[PDB]
Design an enzyme around this catalytic site. Structure first.
Site, mmCIF file in Angstrom:
data_model
loop_
_atom_site.group_PDB
_atom_site.id
_atom_site.type_symbol
_atom_site.label_atom_id
_atom_site.label_comp_id
_atom_site.label_asym_id
_atom_site.label_seq_id
_atom_site.Cartn_x
_atom_site.Cartn_y
_atom_site.Cartn_z
ATOM 1 N N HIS A 87 0.854 -1.188 0.000
ATOM 2 C CA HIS A 87 0.000 0.000 0.000
ATOM 3 C C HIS A 87 0.892 1.240 0.000
ATOM 4 C CE1 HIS A 87 -3.103 -2.960 1.296
ATOM 5 N NE2 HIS A 87 -3.782 -2.257 0.405
ATOM 6 N N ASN A 88 1.340 1.607 -1.207
ATOM 7 C CA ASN A 88 2.270 2.712 -1.450
ATOM 8 C C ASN A 88 1.797 3.514 -2.653
ATOM 9 O OD1 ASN A 88 3.098 1.077 -3.753
ATOM 10 N ND2 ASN A 88 4.348 -0.069 -2.279
ATOM 11 N N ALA B 51 -2.284 -17.685 -1.613
ATOM 12 C CA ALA B 51 -2.689 -16.306 -1.442
ATOM 13 C C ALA B 51 -3.627 -15.896 -2.556
ATOM 14 C CB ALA B 51 -1.461 -15.406 -1.392
ATOM 15 N N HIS C 229 0.968 1.467 -5.783
ATOM 16 C CA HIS C 229 -0.355 0.855 -5.713
ATOM 17 C C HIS C 229 -1.455 1.847 -6.112
ATOM 18 C CE1 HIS C 229 -3.836 -1.364 -4.352
ATOM 19 N NE2 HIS C 229 -4.138 -0.363 -3.548
HETATM 20 C C1 EZU Z 1 -4.216 -13.503 0.627
HETATM 21 C C2 EZU Z 1 -5.050 -12.407 -0.025
HETATM 22 N N1 EZU Z 1 -4.712 -12.269 -1.436
HETATM 23 C C3 EZU Z 1 -4.879 -11.139 -2.173
HETATM 24 N N2 EZU Z 1 -5.441 -10.109 -1.576
HETATM 25 C C4 EZU Z 1 -5.451 -9.007 -2.353
HETATM 26 C C5 EZU Z 1 -5.017 -8.876 -3.672
HETATM 27 C C6 EZU Z 1 -5.027 -7.493 -3.907
HETATM 28 N N3 EZU Z 1 -5.428 -6.811 -2.843
HETATM 29 N N4 EZU Z 1 -5.703 -7.757 -1.888
HETATM 30 C C7 EZU Z 1 -6.213 -7.353 -0.569
HETATM 31 C C8 EZU Z 1 -7.531 -6.593 -0.655
HETATM 32 C C9 EZU Z 1 -7.518 -5.695 0.543
HETATM 33 C C10 EZU Z 1 -6.136 -5.290 0.714
HETATM 34 C C11 EZU Z 1 -5.260 -6.425 0.181
HETATM 35 C C12 EZU Z 1 -4.420 -10.040 -4.293
HETATM 36 O O1 EZU Z 1 -3.953 -10.114 -5.440
HETATM 37 N N5 EZU Z 1 -4.393 -11.134 -3.449
HETATM 38 C C13 EZU Z 1 -6.533 -12.763 0.112
HETATM 39 O O2 EZU Z 1 -6.983 -13.707 -0.508
HETATM 40 N N6 EZU Z 1 -7.309 -12.023 0.917
HETATM 41 C C14 EZU Z 1 -8.653 -12.261 1.450
HETATM 42 C C15 EZU Z 1 -8.684 -10.779 1.882
HETATM 43 C C16 EZU Z 1 -9.755 -9.787 1.403
HETATM 44 O O3 EZU Z 1 -9.865 -9.204 2.725
HETATM 45 C C17 EZU Z 1 -9.107 -10.308 3.281
HETATM 46 C C18 EZU Z 1 -7.199 -10.676 1.471
HETATM 47 MG MG MG Z 2 -7.566 0.426 0.891
HETATM 48 ZN ZN ZN Z 3 -6.117 -0.431 -1.962
#
Ligand code: EZU
Ligand code: MG
Ligand code: ZN
Ligand code: EZU
Ligand code: MG
Ligand code: ZN
Lengths: 320, 318
Positions: B67-68, B267, B71
């Site tokens: 988160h920079n 992930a 992003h």
């Molecule tokens: C491990 C993670 N993977 C994941 N989360 C993401 C992406 C982009 N932003 N975020 C989040 C979106 C919010 C900031 C980072 C991405 O490409 N993969 C995942 O599957 N989760 C479930 C959550 C959704 O809230 C929990 C994160």
């Molecule tokens: Mg946000």
């Molecule tokens: Zn964001």
């Protein structure tokens, strides 16, 4: 009307059940009764069979899950299994007729609230049937009230010995769908699996009970595409009951509890412990079940475990 | 940091490699989109204001793994892409374009590198300030309008107060819609309105603007494999900071952030299959051109991380 590609699809558990209006579904059912030779062997009037199918349809309520499309799923899955397991070499036409008619009739006039509600709420049905499988007992009574109407009576040209035998087989099969009897009915079955005999009446009667039990709860055998909206419909109904159970102070089943029930956790258990062992010991009689049904049950279980871990991730983020 | 006409063209597509440019040229790219979209033109945005504000915004993003400022360039740039791909100039007013664009640029200002669960369980000033309600997104949106509160960063200075109120409101809905805690609630409201969508209907259009900002927010796996994969690494890096610190303090650790549990495969597989694909599936029903441009890379990345997971499991046989 119906295509010839449809009529062919109708024989496999990949048939897409959400594509069809009620009209097209009654023709699929009708067709199964011709194509299985049931019309021929029991002298079924072909118009009486249409009437009866429409007779059945009206008496099915508009429930989120337990509705006329559900009984089509069960009938169509029974049909699929006749072909996949060659059941017409292992069963008389009478046993087939009982299997397909019971599969069409086994949730007639479901009201949308299960036996536990019925009893705990002291419903007319629980009071009429003395807490003993009230819904299933109600389903049979309706199916035979329907057949007591002469133009709905697909059995009009069957002799009384045959009627009595068909009616007794249908009662067993419909009453065997009460899930409270699952472990009992499963235990009786596997016990007979150590030495299953196609010529043992008890054994055939137990194999049919498992067969309709398999169809009843076989939505996750269908392709993820077809299977997934059924769970949604199931939870709707289920929440519809548990909401009532609390404007009423009646006990609330954890698997219908909005605070504890996700689509993932509604299926993960049910596939692992109910659907897979059941189809496993069935595969012990029909090995070709392993590829066509036991397989989608492994990919379904595996998808839904993935969904649970994402769901849980999301549940960190609320609940503060 | 003058933009070449080749770059101007690549800037409108989700294939734009976001990793080549340094804060200077990203700032320039952001600037071009306000001119190119008619926002400079139609809101009498001073062009020198628009340069200070962008650097005003750039200062207030921290140097977190994920988160920079880079992003926020991706999120605005994917929005920009979607305005052209789905021709949202035909569907939305230039105020709606202004809301979507500015909200993307600001949606994560001053992100600290620790999500809402850390803020709440550590009972930090943000959580205490926001009463456990979306403390990050509440704070992102507040920094934005503190920046626009300064006269030398107010790219809104020539908008009549009736207009400013109109934009501030929409901006806040969008920025607070990016709290992932609300994903299912917002998606569900959207799928409801989508059964018979209506572009004339303000509620139908506020949900669509929320879906769009949510789409661009997590759009990393819509980019090509070479652009996306290093974002996955920054992501686990920020997360690993959070769960390491959680451990040192006796705070709960989210399993999906756990150093000793999460792989790049795990992930991404559930996230793509159960959040990205379904979300872009419903957008594709208003804008079928999205299936070709964004579902297409989402299905490829799905399968790719799926085989990667089988490889990982098979190698976990030591
Ligand atoms: C491990 C993670 N993977 C994941 N989360 C993401 C992406 C982009 N932003 N975020 C989040 C979106 C919010 C900031 C980072 C991405 O490409 N993969 C995942 O599957 N989760 C479930 C959550 C959704 O809230 C929990 C994160
Ligand atoms: Mg946000
Ligand atoms: Zn964001
Ligand atoms: C776990 C949950 N899930 C569940 N129930 C189902 C399915 C199909 N039919 N039924 C019901 C079974 C017959 C009516 C619909 C299914 O795919 N999942 C559930 O409801 N179970 C079954 C019981 C209820 O008594 C055992 C706990
Ligand atoms: Mg039943
Ligand atoms: Zn049933």
């Amino acid at each position: 009307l119906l295509s010839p590609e449809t009529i062919e699809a109708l024989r496999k558990p990949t048939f897409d059940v959400w594509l069809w209006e009620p009209n097209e579904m009654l023709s699929c059912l009708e067709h199964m009764y011709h194509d299985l030779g049931l019309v021929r062997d029991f002298s079924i009037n072909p118009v009486t069979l249409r009437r009866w199918l429409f007779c059945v349809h009206d008496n099915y309520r508009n429930n989120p899950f337990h509705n006329f499309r559900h009984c089509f799923c069960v009938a169509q899955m029974m049909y699929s299994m006749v072909w996949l397991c060659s059941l017409q070499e292992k069963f008389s036409q009478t046993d087939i007729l009982i299997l397909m008619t019971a599969a069409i009739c086994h949730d007639l006039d479901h009201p949308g609230y299960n036996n536990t509600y019925q009893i705990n709420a002291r419903t007319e049905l629980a009071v009429r049937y003395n807490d003993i499988s009230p819904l299933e007992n109600h389903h049979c009574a309706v199916a035979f009230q329907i057949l007591a109407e002469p133009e709905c009576n697909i059995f009009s040209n069957i002799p009384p010995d045959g009627f009595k035998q068909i009616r007794q087989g249908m009662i067993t099969l419909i009453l065997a769908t009460d899930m409270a009897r699952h472990a009992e009915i499963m235990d009786s079955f596997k016990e007979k699996m150590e030495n299953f005999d196609y010529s043992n009446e008890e054994h055939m009667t137990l194999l049919k009970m498992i067969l309709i039990k398999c169809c009843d709860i076989s939505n996750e055998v269908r392709p993820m595409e077809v299977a997934e909206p059924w769970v949604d419909c199931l939870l709707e109904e289920y929440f519809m009951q548990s909401d009532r159970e609390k404007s009423e102070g009646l006990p609330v089943a954890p698997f219908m509890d909005r605070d504890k029930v996700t689509k993932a956790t509604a299926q993960i258990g049910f596939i692992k412990f109910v659907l897979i062992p059941m189809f496993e010991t069935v595969t012990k009689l029909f090995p070709m079940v392993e590829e066509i049904m036991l397989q989608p049950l492994w990919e379904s279980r595996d998808r839904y475990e993935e969904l649970k871990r994402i769901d849980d991730a999301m549940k960190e983020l609320q609940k503060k």
